[PDB]
Amino acid sequence: PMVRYCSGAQGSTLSFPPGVPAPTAVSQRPSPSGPPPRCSVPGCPHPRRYACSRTGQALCSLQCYRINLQMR
Amino acid sequence: TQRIASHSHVKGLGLDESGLAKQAASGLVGQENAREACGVIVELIKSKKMAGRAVLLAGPPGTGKTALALAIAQELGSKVPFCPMVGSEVYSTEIKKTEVLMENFRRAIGLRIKETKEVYEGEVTELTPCETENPMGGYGKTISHVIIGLKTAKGTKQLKLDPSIFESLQKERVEAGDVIYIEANSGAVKRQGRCDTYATEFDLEAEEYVPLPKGDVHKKKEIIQDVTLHDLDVANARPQGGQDILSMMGQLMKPKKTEITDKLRGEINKVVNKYIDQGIAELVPGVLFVDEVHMLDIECFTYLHRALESSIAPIVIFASNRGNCVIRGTEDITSPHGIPLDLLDRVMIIRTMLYTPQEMKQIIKIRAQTEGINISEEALNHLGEIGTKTTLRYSVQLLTPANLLAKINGKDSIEKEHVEEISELFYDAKSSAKILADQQDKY
Amino acid sequence: TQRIASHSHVKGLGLDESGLAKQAASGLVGQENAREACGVIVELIKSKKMAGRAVLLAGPPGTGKTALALAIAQELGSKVPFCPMVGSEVYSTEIKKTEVLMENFRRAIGLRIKETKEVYEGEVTELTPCETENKTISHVIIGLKTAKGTKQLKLDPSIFESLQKERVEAGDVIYIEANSGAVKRQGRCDTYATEFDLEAEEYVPLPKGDVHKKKEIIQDVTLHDLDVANARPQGGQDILSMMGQLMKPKKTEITDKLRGEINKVVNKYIDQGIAELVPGVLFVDEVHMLDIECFTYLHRALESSIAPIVIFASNRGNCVIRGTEDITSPHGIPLDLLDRVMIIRTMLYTPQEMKQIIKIRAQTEGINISEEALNHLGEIGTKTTLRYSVQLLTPANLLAKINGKDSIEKEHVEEISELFYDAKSSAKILADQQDKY
Amino acid sequence: DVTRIERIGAHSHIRGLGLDDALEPRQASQGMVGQLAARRAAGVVLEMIREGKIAGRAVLIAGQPGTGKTAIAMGMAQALGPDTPFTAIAGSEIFSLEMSKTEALTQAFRRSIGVRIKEETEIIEGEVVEIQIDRPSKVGKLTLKTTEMETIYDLGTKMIESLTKDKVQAGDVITIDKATGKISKLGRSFTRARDYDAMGSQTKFVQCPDGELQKRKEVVHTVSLHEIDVINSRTQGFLALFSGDTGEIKSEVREQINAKVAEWREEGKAEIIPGVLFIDEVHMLDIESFSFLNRALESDMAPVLIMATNRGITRIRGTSYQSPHGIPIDLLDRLLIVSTTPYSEKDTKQILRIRCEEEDVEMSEDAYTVLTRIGLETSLRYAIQLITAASLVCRKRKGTEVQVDDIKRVYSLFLDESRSTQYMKEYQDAFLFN
Amino acid sequence: DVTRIERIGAHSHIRGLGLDDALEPRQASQGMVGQLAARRAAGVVLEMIREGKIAGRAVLIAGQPGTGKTAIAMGMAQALGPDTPFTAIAGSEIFSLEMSKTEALTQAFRRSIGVRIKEETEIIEGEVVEIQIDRSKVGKLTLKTTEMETIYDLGTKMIESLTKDKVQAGDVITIDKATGKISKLGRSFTRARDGSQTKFVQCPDGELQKRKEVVHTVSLHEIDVINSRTQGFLALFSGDTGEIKSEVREQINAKVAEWREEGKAEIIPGVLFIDEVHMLDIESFSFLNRALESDMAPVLIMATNRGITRIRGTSYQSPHGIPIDLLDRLLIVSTTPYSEKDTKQILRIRCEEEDVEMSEDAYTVLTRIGLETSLRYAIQLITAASLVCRKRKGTEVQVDDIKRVYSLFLDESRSTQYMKEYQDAFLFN
Amino acid sequence: LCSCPLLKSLVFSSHCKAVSGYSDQVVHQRRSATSSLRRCLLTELPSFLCVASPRVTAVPLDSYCNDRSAEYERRVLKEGGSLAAKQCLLNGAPELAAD
Ligand SMILES: Nc1ncnc2c1ncn2[C@@H]1O[C@H](COP(=O)(O)OP(=O)(O)O)[C@@H](O)[C@H]1O
Ligand SMILES: Nc1ncnc2c1ncn2[C@@H]1O[C@H](COP(=O)(O)OP(=O)(O)O)[C@@H](O)[C@H]1O
Ligand SMILES: Nc1ncnc2c1ncn2[C@@H]1O[C@H](COP(=O)(O)OP(=O)(O)O)[C@@H](O)[C@H]1O
Ligand SMILES: Nc1ncnc2c1ncn2[C@@H]1O[C@H](COP(=O)(O)OP(=O)(O)O)[C@@H](O)[C@H]1O
Ligand SMILES: [Zn+2]
C-alpha cells in the first residue's frame, strides 16, 4: 500500500502498488479551432469583444451594436 | 537625445604615443603637467601593481581638475569601474562615515564571472507517463519515465525525465499549452503562464497569456555577469530568500544601511581568492574619486591613514579647491589646502594653474562648438575681455542667453550687441558683491 | 591556568578582629586609616539596616582606590552582589543616561528565590488530540511510559501547541512542567537506535524515577533581570513571544509603575518568607566623568529609601564640572552631591612601603628576584613611580629566561629600564623635538 | 599574470620582525631594517605574547612621523603567526551611531582573545549505488560502493527528509554525518554518470573514494568571545554576526559567557589563547574611552594591547588642558612608552634597496646617491613613491636600469607638500578661505 | 527581622506633617521640628489641594542647602493621605532620547491628574463542596457558605471554564458572573484534608451572590496609552510608547469633559512635585507656564536649593535659577536654617528612629559638630558611630568612639584642605 | 542567483543556519583509519554555543473586563488571533499550511 521509488545506477523507476489509485493520466492538447469568432455586422468582423443577449450575437463595439440592435 | 552636460565635452586626456600631452586633445587645452601626471596615473591603474595610492589635485577654482579626473575614466574605458563621491555624502544619519568610506572602497573594485546556462522552453504539446512493463509481486505497477513534449517556432523536441519531477508537475497547476521554464542544471520547474494561442477561445480569463518563446527548445548560452564586491557585501549582508518569516517581515521593514563587520570582508576576500585561483572569475580594480576633500572630518582624515595602509584599498584621487584653511572639527588647527599634514604627506599633490586669456578664448570656442553656437570674431574678443575681467566660468555661462536671444532676434550668429545686452542684464558675482556693499545697511 | 590579573593578588582588606589594620595582610600594605575606615563600612553592608549611603574615595592615582573597592568586594563574599560601573558606561544611544543609573540599583540588589516545581517527564507512548465542534482541539490525551510505570495524562491545547512546536513525535522523551507551561524535548530513546543503521537524531537513555516529582530549586536572580523580564515579553509560550524572541533585544526604559509593582510582588514574597532579599553594593569608578545631570539624578537616587550602598572613586582634584562650562568643583563632584557623600582620605605610599609592593607583585608573577634588583627597582620606583617598577618585572624575567639565568640581575633591570622610557623623561624629550611633532 | 585580492603596499612587504633566538635585533632581516631598540622591544612583547601567562598589559609606541611605528606593528603582526589571533582597529572605527564607544571597546577586547576548539566526528564517504524510498512514515534504503568495501545502510524519516531535501539521486558521491545528520554531495561518478537520463544535466564529476567508508576526522576551529556573545545574546543570531545590526548587549549575558568559558577551560574541551589589539593614532580618542579603558583593562580576560602615538604635548579632545601624547597621566603612566629613534642616512640606502628585491626593479648604483639625498631632504614615503613612479617612467623608456633623468621627470611631475604650500602662498589670495 | 524593600532614609524618619485646627504648628510634631512658617504655608497648600475646587496653581519652595525642605516635601506627601494622585519627578529625569522633553513633562502632567469612576458588578464567592460534569456538556456544582447552601447549573462555556482549572471538593473560590474567570482563593481546613498544600482559607460568610460597587481610579496618561497603542499595558509597561499625537489627547480631554458633564464620574486633581529645578532648560521653563494656563492642570510644588545662578542654555543670570516669567507665575516660601536648640532635638529623634543610645556629652559634642558643620554630616557620623560602639561592646555610645569615627571619616572642607596640599599631584588641578 | 549554481555558492550567508569559513582546504591522511580535515565554506558547531539562557521569564499581561464580549476578544486574541494569520505565521502562508 506504500508507493516505492527505486532509483538505481542504470536508471530511475517509480513503482506504485495496485491498491493506490493511478496518479497519472495522459493529457494532450486538443486541436485548436481554425476560424476565429467574428463581429455581427459583416463589414466589421473582428475577434468578438463581447456577446449580446438581447440580439443574441457577439459585437466588438457599440457602433456595430447600434446596427445589430436596429436590425433585430 | 542626450542632455548636454558641462563636462560632456571632455572625452579623455588625449595622450600621445610617447607619453607627452598634446596641446589640444579631446577638448582639453593647456595643463600639460597635469595631463601628463594623470597620464602616468592611468598607467598605474592599468598596471595594477600598487594599491592604496592616493593622488591629490590642488589649484584655483575653474582649472579643470574635475574635467581631468573625469577624463581619466573616459580614457580608461568601461572595463574598470569608476566611483565619484563627494565629501558631503560621507556625513550621514543612519550609516557612519567609516562604513561609508569602506563601502566606497568595496564599490570601486568589481568582478566578472562567466557562466553557461541551459534552458528548455516552449509550448507543451503532450505529457505522457511512459510505462515500462516490469510486473512484480511486491508492487503491481511500474513507471520508468515521464515524457514531456515541447514545441517552438524553430523546432519541436521531446524530453525523457525521471518520474520524480512528475510529483512537482502534479503538485502545481500544469495545463496543456502552458509555457514553462525548466533548467537542466538546477532541475527546478517553474510555470511561466498560458500560451497566447489559446487566448481567443474565451472573452474573459483570469490567466495571463505569455507568448510562445521564439528559439530552439534547448538553449545553452554563456553570459559574463559583472558584480562588484560591494554588491557581494550587500547580498552577503542580508538574505535574499524570503522563505523565512524573519526574512519576509524584515523584507517588509524599511531597508537601512547597516554597519558590516570585518569578518564578512575577510570571507569575501577568501572566496574571491579561491575563485581567482580557479581562474573562472576575473578581478579588475576600481578608481575612487573624491571631490571637496576639505569638507571631511578630522576623524575621517585620520581614518584614511588606516584605510590607505591596507593592501585592499583601491586607488583614490582627491580634489581640493581651497587653500590654507582651518581643519573641520578643530577650531585652532590650521593646515595647508585644508588637509592635515599626516594624510597630506601620504597623498601625491598635483598643482594646477589658471588659464591665460588666449586659453579662455579657446575654451569658449570649444564650448560654443559643443553647444552648437556660432560666435563672431569681435564678440569673441569682447567676451574674452569679460572672462579675463571676471572668470572663465561666467564667460561660458554668457553663451546660452546670447544664442537664444539671437535666435529670437533672427540672427543665427551671436553679435557684440547681443553679448552687450546680455552682459548688461546679467551681473557677475564680483560686481554683485560690490553692489551689496552700498546697500548692505538696508539688507 | 587562570590568567594573572592586576588586582588578583588582593584577597581583601586584611583587618584583624579588633578592626585595626595590620601592616601587611591580604596582599595589601599601608593605608591603615583607609582600611580601618572600611572596617566599619563592611559592618554596615553586612548589617543591612541602613540604605542610601555613599562613600567617596579620594586619593592620588595609583594609591589603590580600586584595590580597596575590589578588596571590599572580596571581603563581603560571593553572596553579596557587587556591581562595578565606569563613568563612561552611562552614555548609551538606545536609552537615556538616567535609565542606566536607575537600573544599576536593581542590578545591584540581589534576590534569592526558592521555587517548588512539579515535573512530569518520561517516554511518550501515545499522543492524540481530541476533536470538538466549534474542527477545534479541546483537549489532548498523552500517555507516559517509564521504567516505574505508565500513566496517561491530559494536556491543554497550548501545551499541544508547544509540542507541535518542538516537533514531538511518538517514541521520544520530553520534559513537561506545569507552573511555567514551557515544553522541552530531551530526545529519542536509545531502544529504537537499532532499527536504523544511520540516523540524524541523537539517542538518550530512558530516565529513571517517578513520572511526577516535586522538587525545590533555589535560584539567585537580580531585580534588574526581573525588571527586564517584566519589561519585555521575551520568554513565553505565545507566538508573539516567539516573534519577539526573533526580534532584536534593544534596550528600553522601565516605567515607575512597573518598578512599584515589582516592589509590591517582591514585598509579598518577603511576607510569605519564600524569597530572601540581600542588599547589593554599587561601585562607581571615574566619577568625575559623570555629567552634572547624572549627579542631579543622584541627588534623588541617594536619598531614595531602597537605594543600595554606593561607593565612588575620585582620582582627581579641583576640576571643571562636566557640562557647566564655568563652575569648577573639588574632586569633579559638585558641592551638592559632595556634601552628601562621605569622603575617605588616601595617602601616597612611602619609599619603604613601595619595595614591599614590588616584592609581593614580583612573587605573584612567579619571578625570583635578588635583593639587589629589589633595592634597585625600589630606588627607581621612588625616583619615578610604582607602576613603572611594577611593569618592569615581567620583561626582566623574559631576559632572564633568554640568558638562562634563574633570577633577575642588575644588568637585566638596567637593560629593561634602558629600553623603556619613563613618562617624565619622555615628556622632557618631547620638548626638544616638539617643533617636529 | 593572475592578481590576488592582495596587492603591493607600504607595510605589506614586511614578513616579520627579523629577530634571532636570543631576541637580540638583527640589522636586516624579515624585511625590516634599523631601529634596534624598538625591534628589541617588539621582540620582548612578541615573546611575552607567545608566553601568554600574563594578562591585562598595555604597551605604547611613540616617535617622530616616518620612523616606522606602523611598520613595527605590522612586523610583529606578520611574525606572530597565523594560528595566533590578531586585531588591528583605529580610533575612528569604534565611533558609531548605532552602538556606544565603550561597547565597541568591549567588542575589541573580547574580540582580540581567541578560543580554539577541536571536534572529532565520524562521517561516511562513498559512492551511492542505489536509493530506495517507500511512502505510505517513509522508509527506504541506501546502497553505497567503495573500492575497499561495498555497504548497505537503512535510512530513517529525518534521513530521507534530509536526502530528499538535498535532491540526492543514485550515482552521486555524498558525505553523511551520523552524529550531526548533515549530508553534503561532493559530485558524481564518471562511469555511473556516463549513462544518464535524457535530461542531460552537466554539473560536476568526482572519482570514487577508496578505503573505509566510515572514517573519523578532526576539524579544529576558533570562535571569538564577541561572536559567542552575539550568537547567544541574539537568540539564534547567526545572521547578526555578518549583518552587524546587534548592539548594546547586556552585561549579564557577557558575565555568564565569561563564567561558562572559564568552565570550559576547566573541562579542557576548549582552550583560550591570547591576542593582540593594535591601535594607531590613539591621541584623538576621547578621554571617556581612556577612563573606561584604564578600569576595563584590569579584567582577567583583558588581552594585552599596543597603542601608537604620533605627536606629543597636545590637549585631549573634549578637554581644554594639554597633556603629553594627548593621553591623561593615568593611562600614560599606566602603560610603558617605547620611543623610536629617527633613521639615519646609512639605513635609508638599505630601505630603498629593499624595494629593488620587493618590486623587482633593477636600480643603478648612481641612483642611490640622488635618491638617497631626496630621502634625506624629503620623506622616505615620497622616496618610495619616487621609486614606483620612477620605475613606471623607466618602463616608459623601456630601460632595464633606472636612469637619473627618469627620476628627474617624476620629480618634475609631482611636488612635495612644502612646494605645494609655497605655490599655495602665491595663489593663496585667489584660493578660498585663505 | 526580615528586611523590607523600604529602609530608613533621610525623609523616612518622619511620618506625616504635624498641624493644628488653627494651623499653628507645634515645636515637635509628626517627627518634624521647627520651620513654623514653612509648615504653616505647606499646610495651607495641603488644605488647598484637599479642597480641590481650583486648578492650575503653582507654589515654589526656597531655602538654603540643608534646610530639609525636601524632607518637609516628602513629609507633606506622607500627610497627603491614601487614594490621592501624587507624582514625584526630577528636573534631570525629563531628558530622554526615547521621548521628547515636552512629551515627558506633559506626560507627567497627565500622570498627575486622575479620574475616579464607580461601578457595580455581580460577583459570586464561596466554598465549593462538590462539582459534577457530564459530557454539549451539562454539569452542576454546589456552592456552600456558612449562612446558606446553593446548587448551580453550568452551560457550555462554564463547563469549559471548570475543565480549564480543576477544582477539588470543598475549595473556596471566586466565580465572576461577567467574564467567566474562575479563581481559587484557598482551601478549607476541614475539606482540604486527605497535594501542594499552598494555602488555607476559612469558609466565607454573608450572602453568596452580592452586587459590589467597585471604586476605580484611572490616569489620563494610562487611558491615552491604552487608546493610542493596540495594547496599552504592553505599551506602558514596555516603555516603547512615545511621541503620542496631541489630537487623540485633545479628544480624550473632550470626552472626559463630557463625562464630568454627565456626572457619572468625577475628576481628582493630582499633586506634581519637581526636584532640583535650579538647572533646567528654558523650553520646559516656558512650557510650565502654558501647561499651568491649561484648563485642567494638577497642583505642583518645585524645590530649588541653589540661589541666583545662570540658567542652562542661555548666558543670562536669572534670580533663583529661574526666569522672571516663571518666578512671577508662582509664590515662593522661604525656609530658615535650624536653631542650635533644634539640632540636638533632631539628633535625639534620629537616635529614637535609628535605635541608638548615646549620652549627653555625645549630644553636646555632636551639637558642636552641628554648629561648625552641617547637620547632615553629623547624621552621617552617628550611623557609623553605632557600629564602632558595637565593636566596643558598650551599651552606650561614647565620645571616644565618636572621635574614632570622626577620625575615620572627614568633612568635605577637610578633604578640600588635604586636597589643597596634594592638589599639585592630582590631575588637572 | 538561483539560475547559476556558482553564483549561489558565492553567497554562503543564510539566516537559517550558521556559517564559518575557517577551513579553506582539505588535507587527508589515508590509512586503515583515515582522518581528513574539512574544507570550503560549511561550518556550524551549534552544540557548544547557546548554553547561556535568561534567568527568569515572564508571561505577557492580559486585560480583565466586566462584560462577555471583551472575554470573546480576549480569548480570540490570546488563542488563535486570526486563523489565516496564525497558520500564515506558523507555515508562513495559508496555502503553505494546506501545502
Ligand atoms: N582645459 C579645459 N578645456 C576645456 N574646458 C575646461 C578646461 N578646464 C575646465 N573646463 C571647464 O570648466 C568647467 C568647470 O571646471 P571645474 O570643475 O570648476 O574645474 P576645477 O575643478 O579645476 O575648479 C568644466 O565644466 C569644464 O568643462
Ligand atoms: N596597599 C597596597 N598593597 C598592595 N598593592 C597595592 C596597594 N595599593 C595599590 N596596590 C596595587 O597597585 C596597583 C595600581 O593601583 P591603582 O588601581 O592605580 O590605584 P588607584 O585606583 O588609587 O589609582 C593595583 O593593581 C594594586 O594591586
Ligand atoms: N624598519 C623599517 N624597515 C623598512 N622600511 C621602513 C621601516 N620603517 C619605516 N619604513 C618605511 O617608511 C615608510 C613610511 O613610514 P611611516 O608609516 O611614515 O612610519 P611611522 O608610522 O612611524 O610614521 C613606509 O612606507 C615604510 O616602508
Ligand atoms: N523637620 C525636621 N526634623 C528633623 N530632621 C529634619 C527635618 N527636616 C529635615 N531634616 C533632616 O534633613 C535631612 C535632609 O535634608 P535635605 O532635605 O537634603 O535639605 P535640603 O532640602 O536643604 O537639601 C534629613 O536627613 C533629615 O534628618
Ligand atoms: Zn463591430
PDB file of N, CA and C in Angstrom, chain C residues 139 156 178, chain E residues 128 131 133 141 154 157-169 171 173-176 180-185, chain F residues 64 71 74-75 78:
ATOM      1  N   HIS C 139      -9.089  19.192  23.973  1.00  0.00           N
ATOM      2  CA  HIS C 139      -8.216  18.559  24.950  1.00  0.00           C
ATOM      3  C   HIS C 139      -7.191  17.691  24.233  1.00  0.00           C
ATOM      4  N   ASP C 156      -3.355  20.525  27.681  1.00  0.00           N
ATOM      5  CA  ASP C 156      -4.112  21.627  27.113  1.00  0.00           C
ATOM      6  C   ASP C 156      -3.673  21.908  25.678  1.00  0.00           C
ATOM      7  N   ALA C 178       4.531  22.351  34.825  1.00  0.00           N
ATOM      8  CA  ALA C 178       3.159  22.822  34.992  1.00  0.00           C
ATOM      9  C   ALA C 178       3.076  24.338  35.150  1.00  0.00           C
TER      10      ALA C 178
ATOM     11  N   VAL E 128     -16.686  25.583  47.578  1.00  0.00           N
ATOM     12  CA  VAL E 128     -17.333  24.647  46.666  1.00  0.00           C
ATOM     13  C   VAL E 128     -17.208  23.250  47.263  1.00  0.00           C
ATOM     14  N   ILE E 131     -18.546  19.154  42.746  1.00  0.00           N
ATOM     15  CA  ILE E 131     -18.654  19.529  41.340  1.00  0.00           C
ATOM     16  C   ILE E 131     -18.908  18.271  40.523  1.00  0.00           C
ATOM     17  N   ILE E 133     -19.723  16.975  36.408  1.00  0.00           N
ATOM     18  CA  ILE E 133     -19.708  17.328  34.993  1.00  0.00           C
ATOM     19  C   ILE E 133     -20.007  16.078  34.177  1.00  0.00           C
ATOM     20  N   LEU E 141     -22.813  22.161  40.107  1.00  0.00           N
ATOM     21  CA  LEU E 141     -21.911  22.279  41.243  1.00  0.00           C
ATOM     22  C   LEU E 141     -22.679  22.786  42.456  1.00  0.00           C
ATOM     23  N   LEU E 154     -24.423  24.644  35.070  1.00  0.00           N
ATOM     24  CA  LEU E 154     -23.450  25.283  34.199  1.00  0.00           C
ATOM     25  C   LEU E 154     -23.810  25.065  32.736  1.00  0.00           C
ATOM     26  N   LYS E 157     -19.919  27.141  28.163  1.00  0.00           N
ATOM     27  CA  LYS E 157     -18.771  27.979  28.487  1.00  0.00           C
ATOM     28  C   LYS E 157     -18.349  27.815  29.942  1.00  0.00           C
ATOM     29  N   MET E 158     -19.316  27.680  30.852  1.00  0.00           N
ATOM     30  CA  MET E 158     -18.980  27.458  32.253  1.00  0.00           C
ATOM     31  C   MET E 158     -18.355  26.086  32.468  1.00  0.00           C
ATOM     32  N   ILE E 159     -18.806  25.073  31.724  1.00  0.00           N
ATOM     33  CA  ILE E 159     -18.170  23.761  31.807  1.00  0.00           C
ATOM     34  C   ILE E 159     -16.749  23.825  31.262  1.00  0.00           C
ATOM     35  N   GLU E 160     -16.531  24.613  30.204  1.00  0.00           N
ATOM     36  CA  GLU E 160     -15.178  24.791  29.688  1.00  0.00           C
ATOM     37  C   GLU E 160     -14.287  25.480  30.715  1.00  0.00           C
ATOM     38  N   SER E 161     -14.807  26.519  31.375  1.00  0.00           N
ATOM     39  CA  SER E 161     -14.027  27.215  32.391  1.00  0.00           C
ATOM     40  C   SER E 161     -13.766  26.330  33.603  1.00  0.00           C
ATOM     41  N   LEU E 162     -14.668  25.391  33.894  1.00  0.00           N
ATOM     42  CA  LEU E 162     -14.447  24.468  35.000  1.00  0.00           C
ATOM     43  C   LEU E 162     -13.401  23.418  34.642  1.00  0.00           C
ATOM     44  N   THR E 163     -13.481  22.857  33.433  1.00  0.00           N
ATOM     45  CA  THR E 163     -12.483  21.889  32.996  1.00  0.00           C
ATOM     46  C   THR E 163     -11.124  22.533  32.754  1.00  0.00           C
ATOM     47  N   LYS E 164     -11.076  23.855  32.583  1.00  0.00           N
ATOM     48  CA  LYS E 164      -9.793  24.528  32.404  1.00  0.00           C
ATOM     49  C   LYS E 164      -8.992  24.532  33.699  1.00  0.00           C
ATOM     50  N   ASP E 165      -9.616  24.947  34.800  1.00  0.00           N
ATOM     51  CA  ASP E 165      -8.987  24.954  36.118  1.00  0.00           C
ATOM     52  C   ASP E 165      -9.718  23.947  36.999  1.00  0.00           C
ATOM     53  N   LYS E 166      -9.048  22.842  37.318  1.00  0.00           N
ATOM     54  CA  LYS E 166      -9.675  21.786  38.100  1.00  0.00           C
ATOM     55  C   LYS E 166      -9.813  22.211  39.557  1.00  0.00           C
ATOM     56  N   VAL E 167     -11.011  22.033  40.109  1.00  0.00           N
ATOM     57  CA  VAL E 167     -11.314  22.383  41.491  1.00  0.00           C
ATOM     58  C   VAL E 167     -11.746  21.119  42.219  1.00  0.00           C
ATOM     59  N   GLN E 168     -11.103  20.838  43.349  1.00  0.00           N
ATOM     60  CA  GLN E 168     -11.418  19.656  44.139  1.00  0.00           C
ATOM     61  C   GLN E 168     -12.616  19.946  45.041  1.00  0.00           C
ATOM     62  N   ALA E 169     -12.911  19.021  45.951  1.00  0.00           N
ATOM     63  CA  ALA E 169     -14.066  19.153  46.827  1.00  0.00           C
ATOM     64  C   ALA E 169     -13.772  20.132  47.957  1.00  0.00           C
ATOM     65  N   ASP E 171     -13.436  23.711  48.056  1.00  0.00           N
ATOM     66  CA  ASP E 171     -12.397  24.701  47.797  1.00  0.00           C
ATOM     67  C   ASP E 171     -13.034  26.078  47.691  1.00  0.00           C
ATOM     68  N   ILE E 173     -13.425  29.536  46.342  1.00  0.00           N
ATOM     69  CA  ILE E 173     -13.083  30.171  45.077  1.00  0.00           C
ATOM     70  C   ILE E 173     -13.987  31.382  44.872  1.00  0.00           C
ATOM     71  N   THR E 174     -13.618  32.197  43.885  1.00  0.00           N
ATOM     72  CA  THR E 174     -14.391  33.363  43.474  1.00  0.00           C
ATOM     73  C   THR E 174     -14.752  33.214  42.004  1.00  0.00           C
ATOM     74  N   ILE E 175     -16.047  33.101  41.722  1.00  0.00           N
ATOM     75  CA  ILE E 175     -16.565  32.975  40.366  1.00  0.00           C
ATOM     76  C   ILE E 175     -17.160  34.316  39.958  1.00  0.00           C
ATOM     77  N   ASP E 176     -16.693  34.849  38.833  1.00  0.00           N
ATOM     78  CA  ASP E 176     -17.232  36.081  38.276  1.00  0.00           C
ATOM     79  C   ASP E 176     -18.321  35.737  37.268  1.00  0.00           C
ATOM     80  N   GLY E 180     -16.259  35.288  33.400  1.00  0.00           N
ATOM     81  CA  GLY E 180     -16.222  33.843  33.458  1.00  0.00           C
ATOM     82  C   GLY E 180     -14.932  33.250  33.974  1.00  0.00           C
ATOM     83  N   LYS E 181     -14.024  34.067  34.499  1.00  0.00           N
ATOM     84  CA  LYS E 181     -12.758  33.577  35.028  1.00  0.00           C
ATOM     85  C   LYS E 181     -12.967  33.038  36.438  1.00  0.00           C
ATOM     86  N   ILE E 182     -12.629  31.768  36.644  1.00  0.00           N
ATOM     87  CA  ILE E 182     -12.720  31.129  37.952  1.00  0.00           C
ATOM     88  C   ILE E 182     -11.349  31.186  38.606  1.00  0.00           C
ATOM     89  N   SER E 183     -11.293  31.752  39.809  1.00  0.00           N
ATOM     90  CA  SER E 183     -10.059  31.878  40.571  1.00  0.00           C
ATOM     91  C   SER E 183     -10.258  31.247  41.940  1.00  0.00           C
ATOM     92  N   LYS E 184      -9.336  30.369  42.325  1.00  0.00           N
ATOM     93  CA  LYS E 184      -9.414  29.670  43.604  1.00  0.00           C
ATOM     94  C   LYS E 184      -8.671  30.486  44.655  1.00  0.00           C
ATOM     95  N   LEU E 185      -9.409  30.978  45.653  1.00  0.00           N
ATOM     96  CA  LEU E 185      -8.783  31.759  46.714  1.00  0.00           C
ATOM     97  C   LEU E 185      -8.028  30.871  47.692  1.00  0.00           C
TER      98      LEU E 185
ATOM     99  N   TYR F  64      -8.632  42.482  31.950  1.00  0.00           N
ATOM    100  CA  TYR F  64      -9.819  41.852  32.519  1.00  0.00           C
ATOM    101  C   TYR F  64     -10.960  42.858  32.500  1.00  0.00           C
ATOM    102  N   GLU F  71     -14.344  39.301  26.820  1.00  0.00           N
ATOM    103  CA  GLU F  71     -13.796  37.962  27.007  1.00  0.00           C
ATOM    104  C   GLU F  71     -13.725  37.208  25.686  1.00  0.00           C
ATOM    105  N   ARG F  74     -10.773  38.635  24.058  1.00  0.00           N
ATOM    106  CA  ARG F  74      -9.584  38.214  24.791  1.00  0.00           C
ATOM    107  C   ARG F  74      -9.213  36.773  24.463  1.00  0.00           C
ATOM    108  N   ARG F  75     -10.210  35.893  24.348  1.00  0.00           N
ATOM    109  CA  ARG F  75      -9.930  34.503  24.002  1.00  0.00           C
ATOM    110  C   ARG F  75      -9.474  34.376  22.554  1.00  0.00           C
ATOM    111  N   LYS F  78      -5.889  35.868  22.454  1.00  0.00           N
ATOM    112  CA  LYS F  78      -4.886  35.050  23.126  1.00  0.00           C
ATOM    113  C   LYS F  78      -4.674  33.713  22.425  1.00  0.00           C
TER     114      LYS F  78
END
